[PDB]
Design a protein around this motif. Sequence first.
Motif, PDB file in Angstrom:
ATOM      1  N   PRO A  52       0.802  -1.228   0.000  1.00 42.78           N
ATOM      2  CA  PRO A  52       0.000   0.000   0.000  1.00 42.78           C
ATOM      3  C   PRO A  52       0.833   1.276   0.000  1.00 42.78           C
ATOM      4  O   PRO A  52       0.324   2.336  -0.376  1.00 42.78           O
ATOM      5  CB  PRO A  52      -0.870  -0.155   1.251  1.00 42.78           C
TER       6      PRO A  52
ATOM      7  N   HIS B 111       2.697  -7.544   5.384  1.00 42.08           N
ATOM      8  CA  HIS B 111       1.436  -7.830   6.073  1.00 42.08           C
ATOM      9  C   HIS B 111       0.726  -9.052   5.481  1.00 42.08           C
ATOM     10  O   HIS B 111      -0.463  -9.249   5.704  1.00 42.08           O
ATOM     11  CB  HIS B 111       0.514  -6.619   5.988  1.00 42.08           C
ATOM     12  N   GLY B 112       1.464  -9.842   4.706  1.00 41.39           N
ATOM     13  CA  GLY B 112       0.915 -11.036   4.096  1.00 41.39           C
ATOM     14  C   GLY B 112      -0.019 -10.793   2.920  1.00 41.39           C
ATOM     15  O   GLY B 112      -0.746 -11.704   2.502  1.00 41.39           O
ATOM     16  N   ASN B 113       0.009  -9.581   2.370  1.00 39.94           N
ATOM     17  CA  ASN B 113      -0.853  -9.236   1.254  1.00 39.94           C
ATOM     18  C   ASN B 113      -0.146  -9.108  -0.080  1.00 39.94           C
ATOM     19  O   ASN B 113       1.079  -9.001  -0.175  1.00 39.94           O
ATOM     20  CB  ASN B 113      -1.579  -7.917   1.515  1.00 39.94           C
ATOM     21  N   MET B 114      -0.963  -9.094  -1.121  1.00 43.28           N
ATOM     22  CA  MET B 114      -0.474  -8.943  -2.470  1.00 43.28           C
ATOM     23  C   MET B 114      -1.011  -7.632  -3.016  1.00 43.28           C
ATOM     24  O   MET B 114      -1.882  -7.008  -2.410  1.00 43.28           O
ATOM     25  CB  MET B 114      -0.926 -10.124  -3.304  1.00 43.28           C
TER      26      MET B 114
ATOM     27  N   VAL C 234      -2.845  -5.831  -6.123  1.00 44.94           N
ATOM     28  CA  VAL C 234      -3.624  -5.997  -7.343  1.00 44.94           C
ATOM     29  C   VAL C 234      -4.435  -4.730  -7.600  1.00 44.94           C
ATOM     30  O   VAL C 234      -5.569  -4.604  -7.137  1.00 44.94           O
ATOM     31  CB  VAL C 234      -4.599  -7.204  -7.254  1.00 44.94           C
TER      32      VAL C 234
ATOM     33  N   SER D 134      -6.597  -1.460  -9.129  1.00 45.60           N
ATOM     34  CA  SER D 134      -7.966  -1.299  -9.630  1.00 45.60           C
ATOM     35  C   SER D 134      -8.934  -2.346  -9.069  1.00 45.60           C
ATOM     36  O   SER D 134      -9.379  -3.206  -9.860  1.00 45.60           O
ATOM     37  CB  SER D 134      -7.978  -1.340 -11.167  1.00 45.60           C
TER      38      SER D 134
ATOM     39  N   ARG E 147      -9.526  -9.976   5.084  1.00 44.75           N
ATOM     40  CA  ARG E 147      -8.430  -9.025   5.186  1.00 44.75           C
ATOM     41  C   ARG E 147      -7.557  -9.093   3.946  1.00 44.75           C
ATOM     42  O   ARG E 147      -7.157  -8.074   3.392  1.00 44.75           O
ATOM     43  CB  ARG E 147      -7.550  -9.301   6.419  1.00 44.75           C
TER      44      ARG E 147
ATOM     45  N   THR F  31      -5.500  -5.314   2.148  1.00 52.89           N
ATOM     46  CA  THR F  31      -4.790  -5.133   0.902  1.00 52.89           C
ATOM     47  C   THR F  31      -4.717  -3.685   0.427  1.00 52.89           C
ATOM     48  O   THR F  31      -4.020  -3.388  -0.530  1.00 52.89           O
ATOM     49  CB  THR F  31      -5.413  -5.993  -0.183  1.00 52.89           C
ATOM     50  N   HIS F  32      -5.433  -2.781   1.086  1.00 54.71           N
ATOM     51  CA  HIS F  32      -5.392  -1.373   0.679  1.00 54.71           C
ATOM     52  C   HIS F  32      -4.759  -0.488   1.752  1.00 54.71           C
ATOM     53  O   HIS F  32      -4.791   0.734   1.644  1.00 54.71           O
ATOM     54  CB  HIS F  32      -6.798  -0.868   0.346  1.00 54.71           C
ATOM     55  N   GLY F  33      -4.180  -1.127   2.771  1.00 58.98           N
ATOM     56  CA  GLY F  33      -3.543  -0.409   3.855  1.00 58.98           C
ATOM     57  C   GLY F  33      -4.500   0.068   4.931  1.00 58.98           C
ATOM     58  O   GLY F  33      -4.083   0.760   5.858  1.00 58.98           O
TER      59      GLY F  33
END
Lengths: 437, 439
Positions: free
Chosen positions: A289, A430-433, A435, A437, B288, B431-433
Motif C-alpha cells: 500500500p 502484512h501477508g498481502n499482495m 492488485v 484497480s 483481510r 490489501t489497501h492499507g
Amino acid sequence: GNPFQFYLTRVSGVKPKYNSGALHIKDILSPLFGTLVSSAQFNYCFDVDWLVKQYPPEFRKKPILLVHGDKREAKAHLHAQAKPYENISLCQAKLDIAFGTHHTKMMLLLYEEGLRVVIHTSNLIHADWHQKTQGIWLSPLYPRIADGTHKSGESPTHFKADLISYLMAYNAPSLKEWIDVIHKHDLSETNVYLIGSTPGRFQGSQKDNWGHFRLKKLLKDHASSMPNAESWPVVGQFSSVGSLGADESKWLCSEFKESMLTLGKESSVPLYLIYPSVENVRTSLEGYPAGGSLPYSIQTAEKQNWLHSYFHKWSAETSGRSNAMPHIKTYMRPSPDFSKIAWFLVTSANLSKAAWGALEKNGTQLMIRSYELGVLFLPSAFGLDSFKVKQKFEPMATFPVPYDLPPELYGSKDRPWIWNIPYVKAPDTHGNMWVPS
Amino acid sequence: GNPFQFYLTRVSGVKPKYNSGALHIKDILSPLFGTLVSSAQFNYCFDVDWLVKQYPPEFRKKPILLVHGDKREAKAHLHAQAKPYENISLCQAKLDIAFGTHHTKMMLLLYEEGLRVVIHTSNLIHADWHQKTQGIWLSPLYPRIADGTHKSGESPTHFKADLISYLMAYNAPSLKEWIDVIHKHDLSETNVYLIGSTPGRFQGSQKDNWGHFRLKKLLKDHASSMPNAESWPVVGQFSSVGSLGADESKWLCSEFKESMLTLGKESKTPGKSSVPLYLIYPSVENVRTSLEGYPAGGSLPYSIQTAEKQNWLHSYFHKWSAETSGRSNAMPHIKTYMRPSPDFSKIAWFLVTSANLSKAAWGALEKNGTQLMIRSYELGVLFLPSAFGLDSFKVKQKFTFPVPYDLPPELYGSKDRPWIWNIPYVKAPDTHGNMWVPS
C-alpha cells in the motif's frame, strides 16, 4: 533543534530514538509554537475532518484557508468536506495548463506573537504522517514590524520578497490578504532560499524566477565552483517520475542536469537517482500500500527504461527509516567521497518536466505545468564553505541528510516500483499482495 | 461444452484465464444474447444509474421492471433513483411477515427471438460484479410457441409451472404480464429444478412448495440413495448467517440437515447415518487479504449480536478457498449447497441460490411440525444427475460439474475467526492499507 531547522515527520513503528527530533503535524500546530490567530494550508490532497483534529482544541475555530488545485467533482467533494466547518475557506489555484497540479505543501501560521512559515512534503491525510519519510522546514518565529515603523523585513536570501512573489503568481483575493500579513512581518532571520514553480511559459528575465532555471540562477550567484567539481556527483531522490523522453539527452542529462550542476559564475558528472524498488516497497512498514504514494505508471515507465540504469535503492539506516517509504523529495551536491555537500534542497518537486519545467520555442521559453515549492540550503547563507554530512541523522556545520550515502545501485533482479501493475508472487510485510484497480 | 450453463461473474484482477468463461452483466444484456424488448430485474439492492448503463445503448429505453421489497424511506429512495427514467416501472414485493426480505435475484429477458431466464446471486450494484465470487445460471433461449399451436412447453423438471407458481405468489399486476409471457413460451429444454422461497406459512399440500421442504421433496423424488450414503457429506457455503438457536439441534442439524441429506424415496437411519456437515464462510483473514480488503465484509453481514449467541456453530466453519477458479481472494456472495462423495471426487447434486444459512430463507417448522414458515423471497436452481441422464456428477477440479471452490473444504485454524461485520479489526491492515472500524 538545529541551525538548519530541517526535520523529518514522526514514524510509527520505529524505535523512539528515531523520533526524538522528529515532528508530527500536531507538534507543529501546538500552542507552544504560539497563540494561533489564523492559518493557511497549501497542499495537493486533503482530509478536512482529520486536519481539523490536528489543530489544538482551542485553535480549531480560527479561520483556515485551504489552497488547492481540484477541479470539477474533486473540487465539489472538497467543498463538501469543508461544509461542516464554517471557519474554513477554500482557494482553487488556477491550472490553465494541461496536466498541471497544485503540489505545493506549505503552512502559513499567523500568531499573536508573530508569523511562522512551514514548507514540507506531506499531503494533509493521516497516511502521509504515519509511516513515510517526509521532510519539514520550520521558519523561525517572525516578529511583526513595529506598526508605524518603516523597515524592509528582508533577509540576505530575499526570502520575504520571493515568498510574496510566489503567492503573487496565484493572483487570488484570499492570498493577497496573506501577502499583506507577510509585508507586516520581519523575515530577515531567514537563511534558506525559496525555490518555487508556478504554471506558465516564461521568456526573458522571467525564465529565472521558477523551476530548474530558478535553481540554476541561485547556484550561479551564491555557490562557488570548487576544484575538480566535475567529480562532485548530483543526487536526486523522489517519489514519482514523469515522461522524460526517449533518451537521457532529451531533458534529463540535458537541461535538467545542466541546472543541477551549475556552481559559481565561471566556466561527465555522476547522477544518482534514488527511487524505491519493488522490494523496498514490498518489505516497507506499510507493505505494498505504500506504493499508493509512489505513482510511477507502467505506461510512462515502459517508454523510458533507459532511465532505470540510474536508479538506486532507498536506504536510510542513518535515520532508521529504510522501511518508511519516502514521500520527501530531495536534491543535493555531495563531494566525491560523500562526506560533504555543496548544497541541499528539500522540495515537493518530483522528477518531471511538469514540476521543474521544460524549454520550448527553441530554448527561448520555459514551460511549467504546476505548483511546487522547496527550500535551498547553501553553505554561504550559513557562513560556511560546505556542509559536513551528519552520517547519524559539530552542530552548526553538519547537515542532516535523511538517507544513506553513497546510494546503492538497484541489483540486477531489482525493479522500480510501478504502482499500476500487480505484484502477486511475493506477499508483503502484512501477508498481502498488490492488485491495482 | 457446458450443458449446465453455470457461470461465475467476471473478477477484475484475476488472471485472464479465470475470466475466460465468466460473465459480466454487460455480457448477459448484450445484443449477442438476443434483441431485447423488455426485462424484469428481481433483486434486493439496486443502483439504477449504474444498472441502466449496463444495458446496451440501443436497449436502454426498453421497458424495465424492478421487483424489490423496500418499504417506507428505502422505497422512496428507490423511486427517486428511477424517476429520471421513463421506461422504468417498480413492483414492491409484499413482505407481510416480520424481518423478511426480497432476496431473489433473477432477470427475465424478453427478446424478439424468444425468452431467457437468468437466476443469479448478485445485487444490481457495481461492487457485486467487480471483485466477488458470484454465480449465474443461464436458461436456454426459449422460443415462442406458435399461437395456433397447443403445447404445454413444459420440461421434465416442471420448470415452467414452477416458475409461474413462484411469480404467482407475488400477487402483483406487473408480474401477471410476465406470467403470460412465460405461458406463451416453450421452456421444455430446461434441465434444472427451481427452488424458491416465498413468505408465508405452509401446511398440507403447499408444505412441500418452498424452502428446505421443496429441496427435500425434489431429492426424495428425483435422486437415488446409494450404499454408504451416510458417509457422503453435505456442504453449505453462504455469505450471511441467521439466528439458528442455542444449539445445533434447534434447527440446523434437526430439520435443515434432515432435508439436505434426503436421498431417494427409501428411508434408512437405524444406527447408520451421522453425515458430516461442512459450512463454508469467510474468515476474518480471508477478508483481510481479499482483493477488496475489509470493505468486502460489507457484504458478509454476520452481526456480533447474532454470533455471540451461537458460538457452537463456528466449529463447523471452513475457510473460503477457490484456487480451482482462481478466486481465493474474490470474496463469495454466491451461495451453494451440494452433496459430495466421501472423497469429494463426485457430487449427488448441486444447488446455487440466493439463500443464506437462515431460518428466514429456508423456513422453520411451526405448529408441531405441520407448518413451514418462511419470511423471505429466495431463488435458486438445482442440478440433479438424473436430469442429465447421469448417476452422479464428477467434480471438475484444480489439479463434469464446475464446483467454484476447492474440495475438500479447509477447517478454520485455531486462531481463525468468522467474519463479523460490526466489530473492528485493527491488528493487521488489509490489501489497501486500511483497518476496519464499524458503525
